[PDB]
């Protein structure tokens, strides 16, 4: 069983890379493989690291431009190093079972809407599980709303999307059948 | 010389019906299952496609166990040509008997009994009591209904992947046989 | 009076932990005990804890394959530990004057077919109620009318099982008579 | 790794059965290789029942008096049928790089002291492990700690034997160090 983390590449406020160690912990916890976007920076080094520290099985897919900037994690139990962007986000879907999203920037958003589009057109049943358990994306999920109710989105995309506050209830929306 | 006697199979299969295409399948079965040197366990009727499956069995010279509760023995449906006849008290008493003898398990087309012995043996495999091997054999879709319905309770979680690959399905004896057949 | 309820070990569709909790909750209404499959988890939890919540007796029956797994509601007014699938279902059909069926899978279905050939071949007359808000069972029930049509199945064991699509037909229908 | 597990062989207390499964299945988890008494009942079928559930392989070591009395476990993955209680004791020792004690009766603590006189007088270096959670033994340790404080036992036995209140640092002491 396969978990790909969608999270910060950028900052390193105590805050986040604790809940990032905190999910990459619980990941190897389960005894479940890890999937990231294979960086060492910010959140993305703090869940791939807290695996590897918890027994767990880690699979980085990173473009190749990432790796010539010194961004990737060479300590990865498979690093699968890809041309572009679009190959990283297929293989990384391909390869997991359900998705949880962290607080991030831009590369977080592309990460989450990619799967969101997906999941609601019906291409796939995996989980995808937004943890914010501080309000980073209060602003986002209230602007949505507002979309909801000028028919821009349906209620049924919006159900697509499980919201959780804590680590122990993205497990459990992740978890296996 | 090819071991005998070393295998036993249970089939679970109808009681009522007497379509030829049932018949066909279930003779194939039983006249496949002596013709490895397996011995046959049976729910112990003459009729339908379990009278088919034994009659087979015997006539290729096989060795057939009918396990039947005294409640379809009042229903006149016991095949007193079984080489072991037994009759038990219950229903529960009926598939331990037939399971604890049984090293596999095919499933053929059948009704609520068949569906019971289906169940009962699905879930004691997936919850590990076992590893024998489950297969259903569907030539005609007999049960695509069940297996479509059962795809959408996999869908919403009801049923897990690792249950879902618990029931070999084939289409055809010779599979049948080999999915059972001792490692 | 007792009445077992069999239901959903795995998933926590909210829709499902409320049919199973309106459920236990009634049964405790009536001053009736429960029976069931002892866990914790999923609808089997919530029928049980919200029996015990609403001051109803609960009995638990559980194979030891269950208890090592840690799936025993320790909770339960009495826990029965058997050995063995067949002794659970035996004892909790022998405690029981009538039987519920809530949404399930593959252990539930095991229990419905079980007590259904129990009750077409006469060895009892208890109520086996299929209780389906939602059309959970439509695609079973549809294609058993299809084996009824061809000969698979009698117009006799058809009629042992009630379906309702509700919690106050259900107890009705499980009421002594 | 081959890890013997020394535990009860009668009473079906929940948490025994619990602990034991917890241990078989931690075993398992690291590819080693579960030695036992060969029961199936209490926490020695607990044990070895979670160890396969887990794909772990078994090794029952069961003396033909008690497989006589129906207590063999059908599902040892090799079941070794010996002439004599120490024919048995000879064999779990022999197979084994590290033993574990759970609470038990005379027959563990028969496997105990058997263990631990060999590991004291220097015959072996193996681990010797007592994994005891709720204090099943404070009782004989209390009263081991009065013939240290009397000269019947030396510091270097009650060294020998170490003692722990889970199974991960259980496992810790039996590893390959
Ligand atoms: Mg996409
Ligand atoms: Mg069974
Ligand atoms: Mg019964
Ligand atoms: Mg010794």
Excluded at 42 to 65: D, E, H, L, N, Y
Excluded at 122 to 129: A, L
Excluded at 135 to 150: K, P, S, V, Y
Aim: charged share 20%; net charge negative.
């Amino acid at each position: 069983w396969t978990v790909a983390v969608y999270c910060a590449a950028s900052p390193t406020h105590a805050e986040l890379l604790e809940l990032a160690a905190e999910v990459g912990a619980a990941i190897a916890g389960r005894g479940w493989t890890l999937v990231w976007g294979g960086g060492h920076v910010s959140a993305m080094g703090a869940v791939a690291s807290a695996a590897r520290a918890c027994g767990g099985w880690t699979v980085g897919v990173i473009p190749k431009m990432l790796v010539y900037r010194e961004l990737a994690d060479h300590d990865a139990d498979e690093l699968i190093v890809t041309d572009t962007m679009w190959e990283r986000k297929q293989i990384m879907e391909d390869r997991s079972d359900a998705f949880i999203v962290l607080p991030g920037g831009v590369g977080t958003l592309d990460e989450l809407f990619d799967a969101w589009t997906d999941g609601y057109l019906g291409t796939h049943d995996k989980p995808i599980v937004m943890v914010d358990p501080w309000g980073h994306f209060d602003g986002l999920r209230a602007w949505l709303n507002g979309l909801l109710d000028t028919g821009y989105v349906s209620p049924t995309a919006m159900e697509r999307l499980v919201v959780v506050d804590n680590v122990k209830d993205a497990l459990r929306a992740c978890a296996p059948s």
